[PDB]
Symmetry: T
Subunit: 146 residues, 12 copies
């Protein structure tokens, strides 16, 4: 069975709380529950962690070594700032896909910079929660080739 770790970075716990009539009502719990149902349908063992702590995400990545086939990560703000997270992913050598709900290129210029996009298998941005669904499909498709 394939084992996939879903990581959500800082502030994603707030999803669906800020002016939802403007920004959307979907919550992180709903996205995760949706992806668990999908993974179960594909015979994937999915694990999840959301954290506002950089160290907790790094620890999860370290703990994945030897037992996890792929990482799906929405790094949120840490994609722009965390060399430590980059080095955690590089150190464990588990492939990953980077996911952003919104289009991060349509915002401040500082959000164009990433310490993860260049080492990711790929990146999905701007497609909302569907991005997680697609990333999971892509991971399973890849793992199924070899």
């Amino acid at each position: 069975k394939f084992h996939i770790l879903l990581l959500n970075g800082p502030n994603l716990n707030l999803l669906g709380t800020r002016e939802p009539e403007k920004y959307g009502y979907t919550t992180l719990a709903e996205i995760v529950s949706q992806l668990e149902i999908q993974a179960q349908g594909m015979d994937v063992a999915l694990s999840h962690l959301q954290s506002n702590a950089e160290h907790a995400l790094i620890d999860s990545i370290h703990q994945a070594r030897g037992n996890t086939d792929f990482i799906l990560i929405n790094p949120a703000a840490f994609t722009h700032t965390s060399v430590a997270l980059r080095d955690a992913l590089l150190g464990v050598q588990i492939p990953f896909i980077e996911i952003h709900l919104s289009n991060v290129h349509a915002r401040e210029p500082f959000r164009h910079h990433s310490y993860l996009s260049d080492i990711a298998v790929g990146v999905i941005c701007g497609l909302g929660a569907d991005g997680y669904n697609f990333a999971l499909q892509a991971a399973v498709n890849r793992l199924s080739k070899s």
Copy 2:
């Protein structure tokens, strides 16, 4: 009225599957497009396609989409880094689009980080190979099916 989606492919994508296939892969552009057509039929969506090495042909296609096209899926290839004219065609016609790249364009030269399209796209998918077209189509139909 079923949705109509226009798939645009930019320069050099006609070469897919021809450079060192045992190394880079065998999938051709015609295979990708024909698969996407059958996926679209399954979603009860009409799909038109154009691949061109000519910036003007892509621009003309975008202009011609006015009033008959609900969404654009575009793999702009090298034109994403260079074509303000394509950006302005897309803005001019006001049809939403998703930008697709087969490879991870952030893992190559620094100049490929710059785009005249990524900021005005609904979203972007890179590095997932041909599947990125399937996901972009699903994304488009999901978005259209809400509104």
Copy 3:
């Protein structure tokens, strides 16, 4: 021998008057051009026109102007930011030109501040809408009428 002026319009300008007219305005490119033709006739000047989304077509037009054209009026649209080839066509044929933009291109994205044409133009008019073409034509004829 009356003066002959070539009016060139670049990419996407064929869309004028079609995007949200109550917001952006109703004037079309054909209306602007037909008005400029009648203005030119009044000044006893011959006026030729080409609009194209193809860089090569604009370049070919500039080449073809050699020996028959006294001045060029060009709204290069997005190509002003990207086309060194157009710059080099203009320098190659040595026909003076004025650069025209309908909108104030300094009030939009920072990338639109860069031009490969503005430094070699006689002058530049931006932000005055269609009137900018009328003023550019008057400017050209005034300059030709001195020399």
Copy 4:
């Protein structure tokens, strides 16, 4: 009747004095007299001020508030340097057109920078004194729509 203020910035009083056989014989007084005749023909009330003093231009702009429909300004060197002039124009909220006699993009790279061009209705450069004539036509055309 429409009321239009023409402002000329520093050094424009020297027009027609420097190597005129090379640079031109037209003087500022001639341009202004030409524009006054034109404005009178259009039924526009035209006022003028040329100054080498930034504060005098700002004061003129402040004094225009409530009585002036449009500003035509050749800011000369101040277009590259004066945030105060920008803020005067923004503060009084009178639309303006920026005029330069010469093509300022054909000179030093520092002359490409402007604190006015982005907030102007439009800009005319490189057409010599005719630029003022066209700017006045444009202003009247605009004012005549609404």
Copy 5:
């Protein structure tokens, strides 16, 4: 009754411990205690947290949602580095004022960059502890309108 949250970032626990004959004797606990007294006089409930941990500041901000009217924050070094902190503040939509004890424009050029100043109501720097007093007054003045 207004509720205001005072957040202090990394290293501010060291205030008054480094060469005080040179840098001053005022400690963080003194500043906070003095501010609490000022708040009581203004009918404001003042909560406080100092932390060297980015996540603890983010968590405090999240926990302020629905019960806090204004945030006063001295982000210290995180103002230059934390997009996550910026996004916490944007996400909860509680207005805030940024406070620095020293003039952070008089130091290294890297200190000129901030991920918070552009989204703050305002910024006060270089005025020492009084900056907190002024920020608190500003906050109450704004909430009272």
Copy 6:
């Protein structure tokens, strides 16, 4: 030479316009009202306060020069000149009277060019974005520092 502190308030270009631009959406408070309020506050603190607003860079420089030997602290809202005037910076450095820089609006929430300043690095401190209250706080800060 008295024992009473004397503070000079300087206001730069365009600040005379305060309260005239879209009053309903920006406020009706005028510069005259801000200064008169600050004069009352200063009286209450038993401190002398002088004021000058000018659109002329040289007038502000001359005021700074004329403050030598009679002014304990300068409060300055330089407005647009903070981004452009090396001459004002050098006037303040030349006179060695401490100052606080004040902006009504948050200048970091505007164009990127407004992030640059020739004064903020040599000021005792900076207050921005707090409206007229920033003048009140800067005066309190000045008096508090002088009273040490």
Copy 7:
């Protein structure tokens, strides 16, 4: 099997010999090409040529060279500074090339220092006028004659 070399000339090079010949020189593009053809015949090499102002035409020519062309000689003119699509055509077909400029493009505007081709070229010759084409051809044939 003799070697086959494709000579590509980019935009505005059709104007060679026409701008102020007493100042800039009289040699035309057709003269250069016809001389290079006779040089190629002497080296027992087949030489094909295309000059175009259209980026797409150059790209199509490069694509069409696959499987029949041993080396490409290209004077890209202004496209060297702007065309990522041409870079990607060359990389896509994996035919080695030499970049040729008639004039010293480092002695003009700073923007002409940037190239999307010079880093992937076997080499570059600039500033030697028409002779640069002769040298590039000799270089190509020498390289092919070793391997």
Copy 8:
């Protein structure tokens, strides 16, 4: 307060992974082995050595704060934090304990972003690219300087 020097060794994020990534091509030496070797060296020099490795920026900052009044020198391999942590820089500046910065690999032979550091300019010195031996040399350097 003793006469014996006390040195604090700090190891930043991901250094716990040492010896786990492609061992045949990168080596089998673990962080535990490096620290135990350094403890033996320190014993031999009659110096006390404390160690902490953490993936948490705050844990390293807290360790630095807790070193006040008991630590003569800090040896730090900050790993990725050297490029990003102004907070660590300010912890070290706040405590005023001298330190040496250590990197196992040559960080200048990697991505250009790794050339930037918030620590290298305030360190006594920097050692990079010499593998585990860099820790040995940094400890020798520290003791040599303290012994002056």
Copy 9:
């Protein structure tokens, strides 16, 4: 008889008033008076203006047209900021030498930028008051050829 105009920019009126035991006692009036005497010995008529106002310097330059052979200018802070001053000098086409008392390359990096140095005949910096003496000699030497 050559006529030379000496222009002094903003804040130079303060020369000799700030910590003179440290920065020196030489005042602007002393420098100008000494230079006047030197000029008299060289058969030069020397005119002078110091101003904190950009427009006053520009006006002086304009007024020099047709009656002034050379300009010696210590532009002070305006060298870094005034395109208008550059254009006044270009417009009147009177050659000039730029003088700074201190070494303006030994200070903030912003002081390295100038709108005048590239169009000056030459520049003298860091030599104190002597720089004016040398500039005057240079000017006369050039006019005498």
Copy 10:
């Protein structure tokens, strides 16, 4: 008879010594001997100097004044660093062609910068030793026009 000076800069004496099975076996002595034979065939008087010393190259250039018609120079690393060499060439006003064996644009970004390319008649890079042959042909062709 035309007189041409060939200058080779630092490290070019190592040619053919570093991993020749990978980088090539051609030595500097062979290139120079090849060019001497070529020059003799063209009736050109060729002089050569290779040096690792910037001053020696500058001195050679100074000594060429009045007796040398053209300079062929492979400046090696000095093209990126030596303003003095640029000023030597400018000072003596002898035209030159710049030659690099390898394609210097395919290496580190710092190698794109040159203090010589902009004042050279032309530049040849990436064609190996043939580059010297072509440069000599170009020089003779030029000299033969006038």
Copy 11:
């Protein structure tokens, strides 16, 4: 028997001559002599050259080809400027360690740039003369494996 070449760049001959009560008394000859003794204890033959001439350093490197196992170099100012020195080292393919006595990141920003650090085995800075001792130990440790 390993052979190691120690190269010292420009101005290092001045070590110990400028304000020694402030900057220290250790001279280059003392450092080299001490290192020679250390080398003898490690069965290493140590050769040395200090030069203010770029070409002399380049020549020494070229002459090391085939007889030298490792290079220890304190390039001084040339680390920031000499592409030629970089290419000499690359050309001869002898591994090297870069040594600086002072912390060159604590000085002007221009000193952060190097044409050697990225191709060195490693770099040691700011540790004074000990840096040479450590570099020598590192070199021997690496050659002994």
Copy 12:
């Protein structure tokens, strides 16, 4: 050790060419003529003057080193080396002899790369664009400063 001042004049690369390039349009004055004139001026001021011109960076560095303990001031026209030689900067800093930088031409009126210098920030002052007279003035400046 005498009471007479000793000044060292250094001329950098290519300055030996003075007077040879297009004489009719650039002038016929040679370096030899400039130096001989400066020697006469120095004699007149009762000051000793030594001179060296070299195209070799190391020769200039060695001259600077050899000036230690015998030279009161250095006058240097570094020519192209001002833009490139950190080594010369460090020689001058190492010897702590004050210097003035001299350029015959206005180097700010040329290519932008000539605006950068490794010497101008550590020089007492700089004179450019005044031709040979710049050497005369720099010598006067040096003697005037030493005479204080």
